[PDB]
Design a protein around this ligand. Structure first.
Ligand SMILES: *S(=O)(=O)OC[C@H]1O[C@@H](n2ccc(N)nc2=O)[C@H](O)[C@@H]1OP(=O)(O)OC[C@H]1O[C@@H](n2cnc3c(N)ncnc32)[C@H](O)[C@@H]1O
Length: 177
């Protein structure tokens, strides 16, 4: 029974927590053991939902937060109706305005380290990458940030608030691992 686990459950909304638990069990991981991974997964989910809230009404197809099988079905429907090429790793959204997948990442290192890692890893050239850090930095493919500045600013503010809440509990150092 860890502090981090109880922190996560009071820090994130129950819908987010439930999705994160589902996602971990589906990969055979235990939220009560891998408590830093639990916190990171909830964080990534909340950022993706906040990001999809920034678009105009029908701008995005949300991929993240679905069962893995259904998430790939929807990806397949998108590729088959748009011609866009199928990503090799599951992206988080599809942008119907810019006609591209978005892979969103949240990092405790300099943004460009994780940006570069994701770039090399998906190697699916056309997929848009957008990284946020817990210190207010962001980095996106082609310097095209997709959303208006306010919708990105509120994501940065929420991430620093998560960081402060962990630090106030002496949990930030082992999370930033
Ligand atoms: S998410 O898309 O918001 O990702 C959040 C964190 O998960 C890491 N990640 C993502 C995808 C894949 N395939 N692997 C993966 O490791 C990602 O790097 C994000 O972590 P941070 O960049 O904030 O770093 C946190 C600490 O975790 C350790 N770490 C991360 N990645 C590592 C790899 N590949 N090898 C070894 N250790 C790794 C570091 O201690 C890091 O400071």
């Amino acid at each position: 029974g860890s502090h981090m686990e109880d922190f996560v459950r009071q820090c994130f909304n129950p819908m987010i927590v439930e999705l994160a638990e589902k996602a971990m069990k589906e990969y055979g991981e235990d939220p009560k053991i891998e408590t830093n991974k639990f916190a990171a997964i909830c964080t990534h989910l909340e950022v993706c939902f906040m990001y999809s809230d920034g678009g105009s009404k029908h701008r995005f197809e949300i991929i993240e937060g679905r069962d893995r099988i259904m998430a790939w079905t929807v990806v397949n429907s998108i590729c088959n109706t748009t011609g866009v090429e199928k990503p090799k790793f599951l992206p988080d959204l599809y942008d119907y305005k810019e006609n591209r997948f978005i892979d969103i990442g949240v990092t405790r290192r300099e943004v460009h380290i994780y940006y570069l890692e994701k770039a090399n890893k998906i190697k699916s050239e056309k997929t848009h990458i957008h990284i946020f850090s817990f210190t207010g930095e962001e980095m996106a493919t082609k310097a095209d940030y997709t959303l208006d500045e306010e919708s990105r600013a509120r994501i940065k503010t929420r991430l620093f608030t998560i960081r402060q809440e962990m630090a106030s509990r002496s949990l930030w150092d082992s999370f930033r691992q």
